[PDB]
Amino acid sequence: NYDGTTYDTDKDVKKGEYLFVLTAWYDQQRTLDSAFRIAKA
Amino acid sequence: NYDGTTYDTDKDVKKGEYLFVLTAWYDQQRTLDSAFRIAKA
């Protein structure tokens, strides 16, 4: 799930750069644990 | 008294905070200091 995003711009005068940042929030999860198993030697 | 005010917004991008800041100027003085007293025991 990606719930929302926000994008904005500015300058960093000391180094000259522009930043062009992006921030957002998300979650991921396994509905059940008997669904996803692991192998191993 | 208060001379005059200054108000401006600001955004720090790297952290996400919005900043609202105020600055003005002032002074306060008493006309005569003999008119006032302190009680004590």
Place this chain on the structure above:
Amino acid sequence: FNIQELPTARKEVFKELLVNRELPQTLRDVITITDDEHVESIPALSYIKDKLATNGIELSLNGSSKYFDRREGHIYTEVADSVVHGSDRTLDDLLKEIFINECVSYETTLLLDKNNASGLIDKDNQDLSLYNQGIKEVSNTSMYDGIKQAMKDIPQTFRRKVSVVMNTEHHDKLIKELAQMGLGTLAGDLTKLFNVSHVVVTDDAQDIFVGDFGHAIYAKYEPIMYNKKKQALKGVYQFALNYVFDIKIVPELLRIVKVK
């Protein structure tokens, strides 16, 4: 898209700003500069080397690939507070007092300093020390007699245009050595004493130089951007300029001096 170019009509304000001769004590009095984008190599090189070739001397490629390269320059300041910006005139004259002083001083560090190809000067700006460039020395006990020997090993074609640089600690000297041998009145008129043009004296220089600095130390500056920003916590702005520069040397016309 958001970014806006600096208006060209505002640029030429800064072109004459970067290059300026108004200050008293700098090599900018004597060296060649410009602001033209098109020029790619020292313009006069051809007329030089053939005239040198008339003599036994001719050029060793001490500078590789004569075509220039683009080296960066950067400025930064912080105005004290908007009260300075609340007015107009004192602001505008304050900035020009700064840049000229900073730009002029910065090229001067790269050339004359004893930093000698390390330390404070960035390693990106590290070849261009004249000590590091490979000039031959002259030596003599008497400094007066010393530099006659060095003005005169110059090719006689370009001897007519030559200029000497000197430290004040050296300036106090020769007027003493003269007085003992006389010519005190002549002293204080160095240009007459040694036929030269544009004698210079400063303090950042550590050792004496001679040579036609008009043709040797060609350079050029070119601006890029001028930025401006408010900072709200403090009352300050953040002004700054960044540009590009580059410079060249012809050490054969120059000679260093070193007295004992």
Place this chain on the structure above:
Amino acid sequence: FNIQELPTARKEVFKELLVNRELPQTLRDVITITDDEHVESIPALSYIKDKLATNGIELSLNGSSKYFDRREGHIYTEVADSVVHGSDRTLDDLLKEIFINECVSYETTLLLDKNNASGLIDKDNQDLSLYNQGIKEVSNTSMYDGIKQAMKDIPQTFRRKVSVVMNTEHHDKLIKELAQMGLGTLAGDLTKLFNVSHVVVTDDAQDIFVGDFGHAIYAKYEPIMYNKKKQALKGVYQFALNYVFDIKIVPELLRIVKVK
């Protein structure tokens, strides 16, 4: 209500009146001044301290709360008689001869005098003596050698702009010390002898000063009122002006000298 404001169009006559450089022998030749109401603090302070911070030195707040304060100034005269006022031109030139002389002289007393933070100078105007400000001393037997030591402990960034002040009793000296060591011809051209700009000589000063007075001794004046009155018993008027002034110091750039 009766009171009438001074017309603004008449004020700027007095703004250029308070500040004037036309006179021969004053520190007004070298120091910074202005007449702008808006400015609240030394304009260049930011560019200074960071450059000083390049060196190990940096500022101690010898002046508290950089924002200016309003100190008062007052003038008073009595014209001899209306016969002077019966005419026009000789009147007008007489006044300007007075004020400039009085205003200029008064700030000069506060700075240089041996009154040293007491006595004739009001206790309200009692910090601003340079002796009272806390500058460090330099000492040497030879005054010629003495001040080389003091020009040279200055930060090399602002060494290019420096100016020396001197008393005539000191002026007669060094030309004697030179003659014994030679350079008599050079003597009489002090600016050449010590690389400096704007050397000054007066008589009110008691001891030798060195430092970049262009950036250190910023000041400002502002007029308030000009009054006029008839006095009928005598034939006299009562002219007077009162204004406001204030001033600042940066002692790190300055150095006092004291020879033995």
